[PDB]
Amino acid sequence: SLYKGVYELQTLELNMETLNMTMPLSCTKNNSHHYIMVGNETGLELTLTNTSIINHKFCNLSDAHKKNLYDHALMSIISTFHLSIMSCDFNGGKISVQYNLSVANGVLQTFMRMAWTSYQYLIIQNTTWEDHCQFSRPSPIGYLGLLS
Amino acid sequence: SLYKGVYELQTLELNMETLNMTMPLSCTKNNSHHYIMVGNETGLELTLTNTSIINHKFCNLSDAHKKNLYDHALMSIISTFHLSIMSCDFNGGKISVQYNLVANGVLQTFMRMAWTSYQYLIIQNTTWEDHCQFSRPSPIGYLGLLS
Amino acid sequence: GTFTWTLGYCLTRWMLIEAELKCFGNTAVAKCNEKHDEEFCDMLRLFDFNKQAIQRLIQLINKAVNALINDQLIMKNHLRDIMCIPYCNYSKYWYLNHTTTGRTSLPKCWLVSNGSYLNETHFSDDIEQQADNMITEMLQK
Amino acid sequence: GTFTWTLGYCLTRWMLIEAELKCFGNTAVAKCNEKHDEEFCDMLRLFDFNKQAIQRLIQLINKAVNALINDQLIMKNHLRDIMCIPYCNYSKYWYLNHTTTGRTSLPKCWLVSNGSYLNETHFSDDIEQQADNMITEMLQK
Amino acid sequence: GTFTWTLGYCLTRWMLIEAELKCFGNTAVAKCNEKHDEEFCDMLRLFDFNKQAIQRLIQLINKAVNALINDQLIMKNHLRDIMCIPYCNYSKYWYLNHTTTGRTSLPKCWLVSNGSYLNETHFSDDIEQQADNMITEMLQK
Amino acid sequence: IQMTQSPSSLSASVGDRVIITCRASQSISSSLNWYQQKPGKAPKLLIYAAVNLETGVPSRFSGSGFGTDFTLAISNVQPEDFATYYCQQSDTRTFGRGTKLDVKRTVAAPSVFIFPPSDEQLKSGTASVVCLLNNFYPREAKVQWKVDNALQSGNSQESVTEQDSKDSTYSLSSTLTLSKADYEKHKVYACEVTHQGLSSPVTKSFNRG
Amino acid sequence: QLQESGGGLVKPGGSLRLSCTASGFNFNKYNMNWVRQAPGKGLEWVSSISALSTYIYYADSLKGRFTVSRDNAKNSLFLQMNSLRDDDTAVYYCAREIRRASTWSADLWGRGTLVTVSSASTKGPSVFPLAGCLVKDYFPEPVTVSWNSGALTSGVHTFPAVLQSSGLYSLSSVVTVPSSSLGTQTYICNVNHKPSNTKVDKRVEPK
Ligand SMILES: *[C@@H]1O[C@H](CO)[C@@H](O[C@@H]2O[C@H](CO)[C@@H](O[C@@H]3O[C@H](CO)[C@@H](O)[C@H](O[C@H]4O[C@H](CO)[C@@H](O)[C@H](O)[C@@H]4O[C@H]4O[C@H](CO)[C@@H](O)[C@H](O)[C@@H]4O[C@H]4O[C@H](CO)[C@@H](O)[C@H](O)[C@@H]4O)[C@@H]3O)[C@H](O)[C@H]2NC(C)=O)[C@H](O)[C@H]1NC(C)=O
Ligand SMILES: *[C@@H]1O[C@H](CO)[C@@H](O[C@@H]2O[C@H](CO)[C@@H](O[C@@H]3O[C@H](CO)[C@@H](O)[C@H](O[C@H]4O[C@H](CO)[C@@H](O)[C@H](O)[C@@H]4O[C@H]4O[C@H](CO)[C@@H](O)[C@H](O)[C@@H]4O)[C@@H]3O)[C@H](O)[C@H]2NC(C)=O)[C@H](O)[C@H]1NC(C)=O
Ligand SMILES: *[C@@H]1O[C@H](CO)[C@@H](O[C@@H]2O[C@H](CO)[C@@H](O[C@@H]3O[C@H](CO[C@H]4O[C@H](CO)[C@@H](O)[C@H](O)[C@@H]4O)[C@@H](O)[C@H](O[C@H]4O[C@H](CO)[C@@H](O)[C@H](O)[C@@H]4O)[C@@H]3O)[C@H](O)[C@H]2NC(C)=O)[C@H](O)[C@H]1NC(C)=O
Ligand SMILES: *[C@@H]1O[C@H](CO)[C@@H](O[C@@H]2O[C@H](CO)[C@@H](O[C@@H]3O[C@H](CO)[C@@H](O)[C@H](O)[C@@H]3O)[C@H](O)[C@H]2NC(C)=O)[C@H](O)[C@H]1NC(C)=O
Ligand SMILES: *[C@@H]1O[C@H](CO)[C@@H](O[C@@H]2O[C@H](CO)[C@@H](O)[C@H](O)[C@H]2NC(C)=O)[C@H](O)[C@H]1NC(C)=O
Ligand SMILES: *[C@@H]1O[C@H](CO)[C@@H](O[C@@H]2O[C@H](CO)[C@@H](O)[C@H](O)[C@H]2NC(C)=O)[C@H](O)[C@H]1NC(C)=O
Ligand SMILES: *[C@@H]1O[C@H](CO)[C@@H](O[C@@H]2O[C@H](CO)[C@@H](O)[C@H](O)[C@H]2NC(C)=O)[C@H](O)[C@H]1NC(C)=O
Ligand SMILES: *[C@@H]1O[C@H](CO)[C@@H](O)[C@H](O)[C@H]1NC(C)=O
Ligand SMILES: *[C@@H]1O[C@H](CO)[C@@H](O)[C@H](O)[C@H]1NC(C)=O
Ligand SMILES: *[C@@H]1O[C@H](CO)[C@@H](O)[C@H](O)[C@H]1NC(C)=O
Ligand SMILES: *[C@@H]1O[C@H](CO)[C@@H](O)[C@H](O)[C@H]1NC(C)=O
Ligand SMILES: *[C@@H]1O[C@H](CO)[C@@H](O)[C@H](O)[C@H]1NC(C)=O
Ligand SMILES: *[C@@H]1O[C@H](CO)[C@@H](O)[C@H](O)[C@H]1NC(C)=O
Ligand SMILES: *[C@@H]1O[C@H](CO)[C@@H](O)[C@H](O)[C@H]1NC(C)=O
Ligand SMILES: *[C@@H]1O[C@H](CO)[C@@H](O)[C@H](O)[C@H]1NC(C)=O
Ligand SMILES: *[C@@H]1O[C@H](CO)[C@@H](O)[C@H](O)[C@H]1NC(C)=O
Ligand SMILES: *[C@@H]1O[C@H](CO)[C@@H](O)[C@H](O)[C@H]1NC(C)=O
């Protein structure tokens, strides 16, 4: 099928994994999990669940930054997340963030903007890199849109 | 040397002191000193020093604003520098700001404006003198820092 | 503001899926300096920026994001997603080839709706429009 | 957004250094309403704003900064400074002048690297390209 | 950024005051795609967005305000108001008509100055300039 | 997806250029890795992504190809570059058959012997006959067995040595083991050797009960 | 480095376990796989496992018998095999995998361990003269053959050991010599086997 008798339609696809060194890349495993990877050895997981991992409602940030034992990129991403729109735990270098959806409307709006709901919580945690992208290909557009 | 046989390369340079009334102008004396000027009578000096002048961690910026005895443009530039990224003293209408090194952001915005073994960075108020020796006055630094 | 990064741009086998060497003319890529509603230029700018950043040196992309891309294009695509209009997943593009001479057209986004790519007949009109533009160009010179 | 200020612009002797009266035609300055990556146009807009503000009246420039310039140009030049590529500090400009005809070209910035300007042969490609653009434009009419 | 919404647009009797249907050609409306200082195109984009929003469904306009309009145009008009220059409040627009042929121009604003209009003689240069542009465009084709 | 490797064993001396091919039925894009393994040692990468080069590897190895074809090229083979090569698809994680590389030499004829079983072996009720081939080249040589007039026992075991350190030649052993019941009721036993440089097949025979 | 252990002799139908320990890199962040090699044949991929043991991939034919896992705390990688078959004797290598160019490639291999499955016991090597020296029916693979305790070193060709149907190994050793020396010195073949202590110096009678 050639258009106008001289032109033919052709297609191409783009690979965003060569951008792994500079831009964070996001992808959705399934409808309940989302993964944003920084570099090639560390990322961040966004989980919609009906389980509780932290009971207290405290959230301290000054002590976490003062200890200066964490990953700069991960803190930057969680900060640009929770200012664009909450139990917290960062002892031992961990990153555990709990959102008590069941405030919720804006958090889910940002979640849908990145990942572009009968779930009680939303948990943000730290993981290592694994081949997780199944439903969507990795692309930096979610974080680029969330930045501005 | 003429290009293509019909064209001659020429040059021009722009003088930006005609903008003194409207927009702040900044220029670098040497690597350790920076100067911003508001008008023809007042400006601020940015010093990279190894010596202390005030020893206290207080910064009563709200009190200084409430006293309403200062210069509007100087405080506006101080506020935009603070927000674009600390000890303070504004008694008697003075303007003294001290940064003890936080260090990365202060240095980054200093480089952006003025586009390290030194310990402290001090911001103070001065009158107008022919300080520019290394860089010609230009308002691009404050325009970029503003937006 | 407006994007400021500047670029016969040629795409290597590490930037594509199931392709070896696809690349375009200078006339086609010259449009990337004077168009505001095209993704392909934004992706090209991101590619170029990554190339220079790695061969010359994440805060860099934090302070350099607005000099490369157009955020309002992302916002428009998000709005068309909300209101159920075909939008861009930001991966697939289509272009014309003209095998007889080799001159091509600047790639345009392949729309997505209901979790699948649109059929070629669902936007075929645009294709003829592009063909028309091309013929006018080859009738202009 | 985009700049909105609207300007045979002629530059007086107090806007220049070691020059009396240099000024251009309408065709050259007409481009300042379209281009998005020019520093000369931004400087012209600042000059015009200052001239129109002194004779009719610092919060004015605080609320009018974005209607005059393109911040992404400043950001691009800052990035080029960090990554060690020649950059422009909005000080020196070069343009071509036809002696017999009198027509000129819109000035472009003279870049700086390692504390000094370039050799005038480090960017002879740009001068040749500008000469070709001028000759095509004048032969078109 | 830059507006991204895309548009023979015809205006119904509910969008006008004391006027029946009035509408233009494709060539005139095509200028709204590539033009950054034009209030008429911003109003057209707002109308279109409202149309799809009501036929396909206030936080929506909070996040879609910058993909339709140009804020620097508003700020420029505000500055012109402060400094006592004629400005546009987005209410009246004038355009030319070719009675024999039917071709029109793109409407431009009718400025105000201290609660009045400019009496058609305070901008008689703009009308002549627009007529010259139209005659050049029609003679070119 | 199954890969086909060619050739099974090519021969070339130092200084010559050698080409190896790995071909696939489908299109695997550019997903192929080239490994080299020495006898009794763990392998090592030579090529990743089917065209790139692993760090610490000499520059005489060139990888190329796309889609259904891939090629490894060595320009000037050094003495430390004789080993077994494998092509592995990096998605299904499957290896290939393997290609062996050996030195070059002028065609040399084999030395074929024959000798009968020993003494206590006959008392053991199961005797084995093996006719030795020594100092030949190349590897391709065929052995057959004839009992009485002409037949095929069908159960013979062959062993071949590695390239010699000095002269780089081969030795082949072919053992045929049979109980005394089969050995007693036959007369003539021969082994037949055929080789590339041997103009006619060569028989070595003995006569026992 | 990657050190592997657990190889040895196991009866058919038994349960076996191999271990691979790593020291020198971050054991937590790397995908690791197990590869197998049969005696005299090409390579073979047993299995692959990801970092947090979320994606485990198995050989098409080896599924249902092999179970792989890892301990990130002790930097270890364990493999378990059940219901072994006779053709499961081979050399096992634990390789470290790295993702780059959108592709998996193994960048470090271990030393590899040998696993043997058979139904046999320790049997002494039967030595016979070939006139030559034939060793037959000895179960453990290694055996030492020499001419007069290393006195002769010219033309001493040995051949790879082979498996006959009985399940016991056999090999031969030969030598080259001109015509005269046949009738001068009577020669002795020395065959040494450790796991049963047989050091036999067997004489050959020229005929
Ligand atoms: C634009 O819009 C379109 C339309 O919605 C979006 O396209 C979709 O993008 C999805 C993301 O890639 C894609 O899903 C993929 O579908 C393929 C084919 O069905 C499937 O194979 C993929 O699953 C594999 O690949 C992902 C890649 O990360 C792995 O995470 C996943 O675990 C699977 O990996 C297996 O296969 C790989 C390749 O073979 C191996 O490298 C990997 O090791 C693993 O191997 C196993 O399987 C082998 C084969 O069975 C086996 O031999 C081996 O032993 C292992 O067992 C993934 O699900 C959608 O198909 C696609 N939809 C379309 C095109 O219509 C697109 O995201 C949008 N663009 C954006 C958002 O930017
Ligand atoms: C963009 O980058 C380029 C590349 O670096 C910049 O170009 C340099 O700009 C500086 C600007 O200061 C310029 O320095 C001047 O050089 C002159 C010639 O060497 C000097 O004479 C001059 O010093 C005199 O002027 C000062 C002005 O305040 C006086 O304070 C000073 O005392 C000096 O002496 C006399 O000055 C006047 C007479 O002019 C007199 O009234 C005084 O009493 C005194 O007697 C400066 O040091 C460099 O020469 C430029 N380099 C080159 C290669 O051209 C450019 O400026 C950058 N653009 C911007 C906007 O920053
Ligand atoms: C995450 O993102 C990074 C960067 O985007 C990716 O790493 C790049 O990968 C590509 C291809 O995989 C590399 O390009 C190739 O580089 C080869 C080696 O040159 C480099 O060598 C060292 C690294 O060892 C660099 O430091 C150095 O600066 C060089 O750039 C070249 O040989 C290749 O060129 C040609 O090679 C053969 C030679 O015969 C040709 O036949 C080929 O056609 C090919 O054109 C090629 O350019 C690139 O160098 C990598 N960059 C970096 C910084 O490492 C990662 O792959 C990516 N991660 C994932 C998981 O995808
Ligand atoms: C999320 O981040 C936390 C914080 O870094 C990770 O936990 C930490 O993981 C490291 C592994 O790199 C552990 O280091 C090890 O500690 C043991 C303690 O004896 C030491 O012997 C080892 O040599 C090594 O240094 C660290 O202890 C651990 N900290 C805590 C509090 O658990 C966590 O693993 C990250 N999440 C994921 C999924 O990886
Ligand atoms: C992420 O990529 C880096 C390289 O960009 C990997 O680090 C190198 O890995 C190779 C492996 O062959 C080593 O030879 C280098 O010494 C490593 N360092 C450098 C600076 O190149 C790193 O291993 C990758 N991360 C993961 C988890 O695989
Ligand atoms: C800054 O410039 C202003 C000009 O607007 C100066 O004000 C004038 O100063 C002269 C001095 O001789 C007086 O004669 C004029 O009457 C002043 N005009 C005014 C006040 O409108 C001002 O002095 C300059 N400042 C300094 C410190 O020199
Ligand atoms: C910085 O600002 C302070 C506050 O105005 C200045 O101090 C006053 O300066 C004026 C100048 O006319 C004098 O009349 C006052 O007597 C000063 N007051 C005090 C308490 O010192 C100070 O001079 C400014 N800095 C510089 C370098 O001029
Ligand atoms: C998504 O996949 C994970 C994989 O462990 C699973 O636990 C989860 O239940 C899945 N989500 C849904 C909604 O099924
Ligand atoms: C989240 O909400 C539930 C509501 O039942 C509550 O029980 C739980 O303590 C909350 N977690 C917090 C506030 O961290
Ligand atoms: C989680 O809890 C909600 C409660 O509103 C329930 O509707 C939902 O079904 C639960 N999740 C699953 C997977 O059942
Ligand atoms: C810059 O000049 C000032 C002038 O007083 C001087 O005190 C200072 O030491 C100079 N800076 C350096 C780094 O020499
Ligand atoms: C600056 O820091 C030094 C040591 O870190 C301290 O002695 C001094 O008091 C500090 N000064 C201020 C104003 O914070
Ligand atoms: C300031 O202190 C640092 C470190 O103590 C030193 O390297 C530097 O030379 C000092 N400044 C001057 C001007 O000597
Ligand atoms: C256009 O067609 C020619 C002829 O096959 C081909 O070589 C070229 O690659 C095509 N254009 C692009 C951009 O692939
Ligand atoms: C160009 O050169 C002519 C002399 O031929 C001169 O009169 C004119 O001013 C020059 N134009 C500019 C912009 O310098
Ligand atoms: C070119 O620039 C260099 C500075 O790098 C300068 O020394 C030289 O004089 C200039 N001119 C020539 C002809 O090299
Ligand atoms: C232009 O004039 C014609 C002739 O009366 C009229 O039909 C048409 O509507 C006019 N155009 C507009 C936009 O009013």
Numbering used by the authors:
A (entry chain C): 60 to 144, 153 to 169, 183 to 196, 215 to 246
B (entry chain A): 60 to 144, 153 to 168, 183 to 196, 215 to 246
C (entry chain c), D (entry chain a), E (entry chain b): 260 to 266, 277 to 326, 334 to 417
F (entry chain L): 1 to 209
G (entry chain H): 3 to 133, 147 to 222
Publication text:
The LASV glycoprotein (GP), the sole protein exposed on the virion surface, is the primary target of the humoral antibody response. The mature, trimeric GP protrudes from the viral membrane as a tripartite complex comprising the stable signal peptide (SSP), the receptor binding subunit GP1, and the transmembrane fusion subunit GP2. Upon reaching the mildly acidic interior of early endosomal compartments, GP undergoes a pH-dependent intracellular receptor switch to disengage from α-DG and bind to lysosome-associated membrane protein 1 (LAMP1). In this study, we present high-resolution epitope maps of the GPC-A mAbs 25.10C and 36.1F determined using cryoelectron microscopy (cryo-EM) and X-ray crystallography, respectively; 25.10C is a highly potent and pan-LASV mAb, while 36.1F is moderately potent and lineage IV-specific.
High-resolution structural data were obtained from 25.10C-pfGP-TD complexes under cryo-EM conditions that resulted in a 3.0Å 3-D reconstruction with three 25.10C Fabs bound to pfGP-TD. The strongest and higher-resolution density corresponds to the Fab-pfGP interface, while the lower resolution density corresponds to the Fab CH/CL domain. Although their footprints overlap, the approach angles of the two antibodies are different: 25.10C binds at an orientation more parallel to the plane of the viral membrane while 36.1F binds down onto GP with its constant domains angled upward from the membrane. However, the 25.10C epitope is distributed over the GP1 (440Å) and GP2 (240 Å) subunits, while the 36.1F epitope is dominated by GP1 contacts, with only a small (40 Å) region contacting GP2. The hydroxyl of Y57 in the 25.10C CDR-H2 forms a hydrogen bond to the ND1 nitrogen of the H230 imidazole side chain in a head-on manner. For 25.10C, CDR-L2 G65 forms a hydrogen bond with R282 in GP2, and hydrophobic interactions with the CDR-L1 and FR-2 domains completely sequester GP2 residues 282 to 289. Due to the absence of contacts between 25.10C and the fusion peptide, there was an unresolvable density for this region in cryo-EM analyses. Hence, only the fusion loop (residues 280–292), which is stabilized by several Fab contacts, could be modeled. The more even distribution of the 25.10C epitope across the GP1 and GP2 subunits (65% GP1 and 35% GP2) may allow 25.10C to also neutralize at a LAMP1-independent step, likely membrane fusion. In contrast, the pan-LASV 25.10C can neutralize by blocking GP association with LAMP1 and can also neutralize in an LAMP-1 independent, pH-independent manner, likely by blocking fusion of virus and host membranes through occupation of the GP2 fusion loop.
